[PDB]
């Protein structure tokens, strides 16, 4: 591992220094159907004319970006996404912009969000949750070693591929930072105490979010929930967590070390780093190299009828993509 990562960092650095730009144009694609929306953008299933391939295109209205003050965040998203390369990270194929929008064309992950399957089924058995969790652990190990922080881990940002493996999407809050950062961003249910308390935080927040993820997958509901975000923040800060009767002793022990309000005791943030997590009993049966190589037989494989099939995604109200005749926010997005 120590060896591998060191070589992937070199690749990342070259692309981080000299990012790719304007690698395609809107007219090379046929817009088909909306796969999902969020706070910032809309993601559409598109077909590439010349090749016939299907992709997932994230569309960002430049004006909406400024209004919401996501300028720096959006620039981070594109810059980081085009520089990374990992089995469990969605791949950015092309990126370009026009008078009104910013575009990011990614590989189409047809399996749907883990969210939809999780909600429909109710919850995942421990071995099933472990399978997904192992992939996130490796993903964060790769990301952190590049000085990157994810900041928006949640089932809504995790896609299942044809082989039943995870593909992490949405790098909207990803940031390269050595040291601490202060932005209050993320999703309510997954915020670490230190973020809410506005004290400056580091990569340790991703490890806390993993805790919440594992908990939600195994239980079927998040550890801290309520009707309004403010009520949730109160629960997160208290640190009081209750485990379902069915959780195994190993799982409970792992979660107590991830959902640790104290940074000096939180797994992943100690001397052994990620090793404390990898060597934990709950992962005793996990073959880390096998997962990385995608040699493990996935516990769940989504039904998929031909390319272009969106049956694993909900339906959304379609909206015309408008392109003004005048250039908007030209200077702000120069490097995009």
């Amino acid at each position: 591992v120590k060896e591998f990562l060191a070589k992937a960092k070199e690749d990342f650095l070259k692309k981080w220094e000299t990012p790719s730009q304007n690698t395609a144009q809107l007219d090379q694609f046929d817009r088909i159907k909306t796969l999902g929306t969020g706070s910032f953008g809309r993601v559409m299933l598109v077909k590439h004319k010349e090749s016939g391939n299907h992709y997932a295109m994230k569309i960002l209205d430049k004006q909406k970006v400024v209004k919401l003050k996501q300028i720096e965040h959006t620039l981070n998203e594109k810059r980081i996404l085009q520089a990374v390369n990992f089995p469990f990270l969605v791949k950015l194929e092309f990126s370009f912009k026009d008078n009104s929008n910013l575009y990011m064309v990614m590989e189409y992950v047809a399996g749907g969000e883990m969210f939809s399957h999780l909600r429909r089924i109710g919850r995942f058995s421990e071995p099933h949750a472990r399978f997904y969790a192992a992939q996130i652990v490796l993903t964060f190990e790769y990301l952190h070693s590049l000085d990157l922080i994810y900041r928006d881990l949640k089932p809504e940002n995790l896609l299942i591929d044809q082989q039943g493996y995870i593909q992490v999407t949405d790098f909207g809050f990803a940031k390269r930072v050595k040291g601490r950062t202060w932005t209050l961003c993320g999703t309510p249910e997954y915020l670490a105490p230190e973020i809410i308390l506005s004290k400056g935080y580091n990569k340790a927040v991703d490890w806390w979010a993993l805790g919440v993820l594992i908990y939600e997958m195994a239980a079927g509901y998040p550890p801290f929930f309520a009707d309004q975000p403010i009520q949730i923040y109160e629960k997160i800060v208290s640190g009081k967590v209750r485990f379902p009767s069915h959780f195994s002793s190993d799982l409970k022990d792992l979660l107590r070390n991830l959902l640790q309000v104290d940074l000096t005791k939180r797994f992943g943030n100690l001397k052994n780093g990620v090793n404390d997590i990898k060597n934990h009993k709950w992962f005793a049966t996990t073959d880390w190299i096998a997962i990385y190589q995608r040699k493990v037989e996935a516990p769940f494989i989504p039904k998929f009828k031909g390319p272009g099939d969106t049956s694993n995604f909900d339906d959304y109200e379609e909206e015309e993509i408008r392109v003004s005749i005048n250039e908007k926010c030209g200077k702000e997005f120069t490097e995009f």
């Binding site: 999902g36 969020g38 706070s39 910032f40 919401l68 003050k69 996501q70 969000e113 969210f115 909600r119 928006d152 949640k154 809504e156 909207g172 809050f173 209050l184 961003c185 993320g186 999703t187 309510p188 249910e189 079927g220 509901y221 929930f225 309520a226 009707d227 975000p229 209750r242 379902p244």
Partner: peptide
């Protein structure tokens, strides 16, 4: 049950990120 309280809550659907 905790599950019943969750299912009756207002945050069982897709959750968007925090934007100010």
């Amino acid at each position: 049950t905790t599950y019943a309280d969750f299912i009756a809550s207002g945050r069982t659907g897709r959750r968007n990120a925090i934007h100010d």
